Design an enzyme around this catalytic site. Structure first.
Site, PDB file in Angstrom:
ATOM      1  N   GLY A   1       2.577  -3.912  -8.163  1.00 45.30           N
ATOM      2  CA  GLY A   1       3.535  -3.982  -9.299  1.00 45.30           C
ATOM      3  C   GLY A   1       3.547  -3.198 -10.486  1.00 45.30           C
ATOM      4  O   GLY A   1       4.643  -3.190 -10.585  1.00 45.30           O
TER       5      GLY A   1
ATOM      6  N   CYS B   1       5.050  -0.189  -9.348  1.00 49.55           N
ATOM      7  CA  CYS B   1       5.346   0.676  -8.332  1.00 49.55           C
ATOM      8  C   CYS B   1       7.258   1.283  -9.367  1.00 49.55           C
ATOM      9  O   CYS B   1       7.334  -0.064 -10.267  1.00 49.55           O
ATOM     10  CB  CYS B   1       6.037   0.305  -6.787  1.00 49.55           C
TER      11      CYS B   1
ATOM     12  N   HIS C   1      11.505   1.169  -0.891  1.00 52.63           N
ATOM     13  CA  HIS C   1      10.506   0.270  -0.803  1.00 52.63           C
ATOM     14  C   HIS C   1      10.263  -1.134  -1.049  1.00 52.63           C
ATOM     15  O   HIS C   1       9.594  -2.237  -0.649  1.00 52.63           O
ATOM     16  CB  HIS C   1       8.571   0.361  -0.584  1.00 52.63           C
TER      17      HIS C   1
HETATM   18  O1  LIG Z   1       2.728  -2.769  -3.570  1.00 53.20           O
HETATM   19  C1  LIG Z   1       3.313  -2.239  -2.622  1.00 53.20           C
HETATM   20  C2  LIG Z   1       3.088  -0.701  -2.191  1.00 53.20           C
HETATM   21  C3  LIG Z   1       2.180  -0.159  -1.425  1.00 53.20           C
HETATM   22  C4  LIG Z   1       0.761   0.396  -2.414  1.00 53.20           C
HETATM   23  O2  LIG Z   1       0.539   1.274  -2.117  1.00 53.20           O
HETATM   24  N1  LIG Z   1       0.877  -0.355  -3.903  1.00 53.20           N
HETATM   25  C5  LIG Z   1      -0.487  -0.231  -4.975  1.00 53.20           C
HETATM   26  C6  LIG Z   1       0.767   0.646  -5.891  1.00 53.20           C
HETATM   27  N2  LIG Z   1      -0.446   1.123  -6.956  1.00 53.20           N
HETATM   28  C7  LIG Z   1      -0.876   0.944  -6.949  1.00 53.20           C
HETATM   29  C8  LIG Z   1      -1.717  -0.373  -6.247  1.00 53.20           C
HETATM   30  C9  LIG Z   1      -3.166  -0.694  -6.390  1.00 53.20           C
HETATM   31  C10 LIG Z   1      -3.484  -1.906  -5.574  1.00 53.20           C
HETATM   32  C11 LIG Z   1      -2.217  -3.094  -4.441  1.00 53.20           C
HETATM   33  C12 LIG Z   1      -1.635  -1.469  -4.081  1.00 53.20           C
HETATM   34  C13 LIG Z   1      -1.187  -1.031  -4.697  1.00 53.20           C
HETATM   35  C14 LIG Z   1       1.379  -1.016  -0.799  1.00 53.20           C
HETATM   36  C15 LIG Z   1       0.491  -0.689   0.601  1.00 53.20           C
HETATM   37  O3  LIG Z   1       0.496   0.399   1.041  1.00 53.20           O
HETATM   38  C16 LIG Z   1       1.916   0.938   0.791  1.00 53.20           C
HETATM   39  C17 LIG Z   1       2.040   2.219   1.364  1.00 53.20           C
HETATM   40  C18 LIG Z   1       3.085   3.184   1.445  1.00 53.20           C
HETATM   41  C19 LIG Z   1       4.144   2.659   0.658  1.00 53.20           C
HETATM   42 CL1  LIG Z   1       4.731   3.795  -0.096  1.00 53.20          CL
HETATM   43  C20 LIG Z   1       3.777   1.895   0.132  1.00 53.20           C
HETATM   44  C21 LIG Z   1       2.328   1.234  -0.301  1.00 53.20           C
HETATM   45  N3  LIG Z   1       4.070  -2.720  -1.742  1.00 53.20           N
HETATM   46  C22 LIG Z   1       3.958  -3.974  -0.645  1.00 53.20           C
HETATM   47  C23 LIG Z   1       4.007  -4.393   0.846  1.00 53.20           C
HETATM   48  N4  LIG Z   1       5.486  -4.403   0.529  1.00 53.20           N
HETATM   49  C24 LIG Z   1       6.054  -5.321  -0.391  1.00 53.20           C
HETATM   50  C25 LIG Z   1       6.285  -6.945   0.813  1.00 53.20           C
HETATM   51  C26 LIG Z   1       5.880  -8.318   0.615  1.00 53.20           C
HETATM   52  O4  LIG Z   1       4.447  -8.441   1.199  1.00 53.20           O
HETATM   53  C27 LIG Z   1       6.229  -3.121  -0.007  1.00 53.20           C
HETATM   54  C28 LIG Z   1       5.929  -3.203  -1.611  1.00 53.20           C
END
Ligand SMILES: O=C(C[C@@]1(C(=O)Nc2cncc3ccccc23)CCOc2ccc(Cl)cc21)N1CCN(CCCO)CC1
Lengths: 296, 300
Positions: B143, B145, B41
């Site tokens: 951050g 991930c 992702h």
């Molecule tokens: O952080 C993410 C991933 C994300 C996610 O869960 N991230 C997080 C992980 N752990 C703790 C967190 C604590 C607070 C907030 C977010 C956390 C966003 C939320 O939903 C999903 C659904 C599925 C999947 Cl696999 C990933 C995600 N992204 C924002 C979206 N995108 C970035 C593009 C710029 O806007 C890609 C990267």
């Protein structure tokens, strides 16, 4: 989200662990620059030390034997001068911590790191660690930016299963001595400022059930706290809790009224951060570092 | 003596953490040999996240689009491939700190250490269990991930988890190092919920044996139980079924303490019925299920 008991990354300390053998005893040593630090019980310590020669101390860093070229004693720590400076020596300091402060322990056996856990220096100066025979010389530390602050060296286990040790200058934490004799940990108390910091962490993570409309004076809170074997909360503690108080919108004396109620009434089958007890091994700085993501 | 939630020393994994940037997104990567592994992702935006077509998004990328940073050194991406939900970025430098490692997929109830990272820098290490619902109750902020889960038995690092997402309940979902998610989760922002969580029964029993090894016997009783009667009681408290494999696994601890597995099962039944009564077991007022039988034996 999430709140875990989190230790500092142990890599900078792992590169320092060595095995120290002297006679029948084998324990761990901390190799920083050209010195190996270890508990002096590996050997009347002045009399026992004078009889030793450098070749009696077998030091091993991995599968490499370090040759001891000198030895001196500083309080309860033995300093073994070696011919080779540790190329993996990080930026470090020797710091003595206060009760209530937390640190990470890198538990070692035979100079090999086996595990890392987060501890707190109890108000009775013991640590509730996890140590077996051979863990002596395992160190406690914190990381500040890229600097390792060594604060603890493990020396002994008391009859209650709790642990006693020294700072890296060999000064014991608590009224303990490095001698097989009758020694007991004093009655322990709860680290009040740490419990409040953990209640702020719970609020940051969405747990508000324990919050109430009430506030308390610092004096009334301390009168209640003393009744439950809780450490007094000082104005310094209230000040240190400032950032968390501002972030959550709950004054420290407002959280103290929640703590007071929790003490008088219990959890009532509820949990706070997955715990049915009030957790006191996270300092206000630990909560800030974890609920903000500071890296090392 | 003493029983702590103990993580593996993180040094072998710290030397592998790198920062991976692609467009606006910055997350963590695992640099082993000449490959950087990271959640796929990283190639998405929030405009892609609902229904991303990763094959289509990846084909549009070039190597110079992925900025990889190991400390204060920028690595050069010379190739990229996708394996399930993990992106594999071939780099022009092999990691000199690459330890002896394996990629292992774990089963629910298994524990591992998590090295939480932000911007390719390790911030903390803690212990986790793969929940029966395939989520982990981690501690992750935005951050994180790409942060990995691992075990370090015998100088070899077994990588078992890579963090990908946080579910609405605050629990975390991710994949093994082959990009296969644990649980019915997808790397999409579509509605996803963790299934009902259950207590890891074999782990609770292992923790009761740890308590006996450390001198806590207050919870023991004169009773035994059949494996079937224990499971009928266990299911009512949202406890995972205890299989004959679990009973077999608990054999060493049973022999060491002299308490038959089904005998310890009857103590657990009683604890579930009565609670603790203001008492603690190993400094806990709840029954702990994030220590496996192997963890108890290792630590004790
Ligand atoms: O952080 C993410 C991933 C994300 C996610 O869960 N991230 C997080 C992980 N752990 C703790 C967190 C604590 C607070 C907030 C977010 C956390 C966003 C939320 O939903 C999903 C659904 C599925 C999947 Cl696999 C990933 C995600 N992204 C924002 C979206 N995108 C970035 C593009 C710029 O806007 C890609 C990267």
């Amino acid at each position: 989200s999430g709140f875990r008991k989190m230790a500092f990354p142990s890599g900078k300390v792992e590169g320092c662990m060595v095995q120290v053998t002297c006679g029948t005893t084998t324990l761990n040593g901390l190799w920083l620059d050209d010195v190996v630090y270890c508990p002096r019980h590996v050997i009347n310590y002045e009399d026992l030390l004078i009889r030793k020669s450098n070749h009696n101390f077998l030091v091993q860093a991995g599968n490499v034997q370090l040759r001891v070229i000198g030895h001196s004693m500083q309080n309860c720590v033995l300093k073994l001068k070696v011919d080779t400076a540790n190329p993996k020596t990080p930026k470090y300091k020797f710091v003595r911590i206060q009760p209530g402060q937390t640190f990470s322990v890198l538990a070692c056996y035979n100079g090999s790191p086996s595990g890392v856990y987060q501890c707190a220096m109890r108000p009775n100066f013991t640590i509730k660690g996890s140590f077996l025979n051979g863990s002596c010389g395992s160190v406690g530390f914190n990381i500040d930016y890229d600097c390792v602050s060594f604060c603890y060296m493990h020396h002994m286990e008391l009859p209650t299963g709790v642990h006693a040790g020294t700072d890296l200058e060999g000064n014991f934490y608590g009224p303990f001595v490095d001698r097989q004799t009758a020694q007991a940990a004093g009655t322990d108390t709860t680290i009040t400022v740490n419990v409040l910091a953990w209640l702020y962490a719970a609020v940051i993570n969405g747990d508000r059930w324990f919050l109430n409309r009430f506030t308390t004076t610092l004096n009334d809170f301390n009168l209640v706290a003393m009744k439950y074997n809780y450490e007094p909360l000082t104005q310094d503690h209230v000040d240190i809790l400032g950032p968390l108080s501002a972030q959550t919108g709950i004054a420290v004396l407002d959280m103290c009224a929640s703590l007071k109620e929790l003490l008088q009434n219990g959890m009532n089958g509820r949990t706070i951060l997955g715990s049915a007890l009030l957790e006191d091994e996270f300092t206000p700085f630990d909560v800030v570092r974890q609920c903000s993501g500071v890296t090392f």
